[PDB]
Amino acid sequence: AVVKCKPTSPGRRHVVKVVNPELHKGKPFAPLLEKNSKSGGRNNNGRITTRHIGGGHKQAYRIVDFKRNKDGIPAVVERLEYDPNRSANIALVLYKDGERRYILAPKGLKAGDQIQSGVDAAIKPGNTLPMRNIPVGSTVHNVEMKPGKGGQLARSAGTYVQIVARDGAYVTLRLRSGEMRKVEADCRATLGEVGNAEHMLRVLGKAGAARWRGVRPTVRGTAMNPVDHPHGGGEGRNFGKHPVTPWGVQTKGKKTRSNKRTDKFIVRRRS
Template sequence: VNPDLHKGAPHAPLLEKQHQKSGRNNNGHITTRHKGGGHKHHYRVVDFKRNDKDGIPAKIERLEYDPNRSANIALVLFADGERRYIIAPKGAVVGQVVANGPEAPIKAGNNLPIRNIPVGTTIHCVEILPGKGAQIARSAGTSAVLLAREGIYAQVRLRSGEVRRVHIECRATIGEVGNEEHSLRQIGKAGATRWRGIRPTVRGVAMNPVDHPHGGGE
């Protein structure tokens, strides 16, 4: 448990209700097995675009836990008085100032177009299409590296080793995603997995022939 995380309630204007799907689609059929139950939680509206506050500095007010993702989130207060959630970068501290836009300095937590980022920089929260919002390298401890720029495209190497080509007008955030020790957590007991909405995984061999290719047999 991170002692720096906010202990109180989340920022209410940035919450939305979430309906539990339990792995079902709009026909009620199970499309993802082993889902259901778990604790209720609200969705935290995270700003993945960060493209309409260029040139307006923001201060990190607090770091918060988010039940909907592995990364922590940061509540930032912009100079114009608006508050938003962003993905908390590695090393983020309360009181830190973050900036958006082409003029932003190359500093962890700042968001700018890839054409303004030096080659070799570690980045996260990378857009695939300009203006769509970050889709790559958003989970805890992840990052990507800007390898090269050629014309209107840039090459970005992901943690998996895959190299993706993205438009230089796509935006990215400098640094890595925080909460990198997320993968080391001890779940402790079966019930803690159930709290997260994950149901038991039954082996195919233990089923009947009607239920699974491995079913049946003595």
């Protein structure tokens, strides 16, 4: 539920929360937690590889069964929990034998529901089954690229992927960015969309909310000095030059897809 907060302090003026009563106000299921240390955008060399990352609140990793391998044994949804890691919400589930796991939350999913993965699974949001067993056109998410690898497609908070065509050992997938891609017809996928579809509706409001999420301030290019960046310098504001990376590479519209191993799977590029 979206809530425009009230302008008490300037800094609350534009804060838009996403209120959900479904979020289990408790401590999460401890045997599926593990330490994820921060990095600050620094590799093993200790150089800042990717910029702008650092600080932020301490986060513990949740072990999400993307691979979704319990088959035949049905599940039942214990509760819906917040995830500090990813944008989408997760749900502690429970099988018949006793194992609890986390999965992602589809949009049409509440607590106490029962789901099941397999090949003989029914078709309701929350099942996961290989896409040769799925009707064409039905929107899914959590799509594996290789069979058994674990879903790497439509895994954010408000995504889904449609299955536009099945033919032979391949299925054509309309990606969320609108890019027709073949996938092998044995990859598994989870039916329906994914829960927090209104995650894009939030507004962070103040700059400290950016800093809570580990994102340092981004300095714009043309503020710098010419030694620092190609956009640098200028008596005042001068920008007589083409918009490029700090490493000189053209940015506005210059494509960068160099992977030619996988061109036979892209049916059509995005638009």
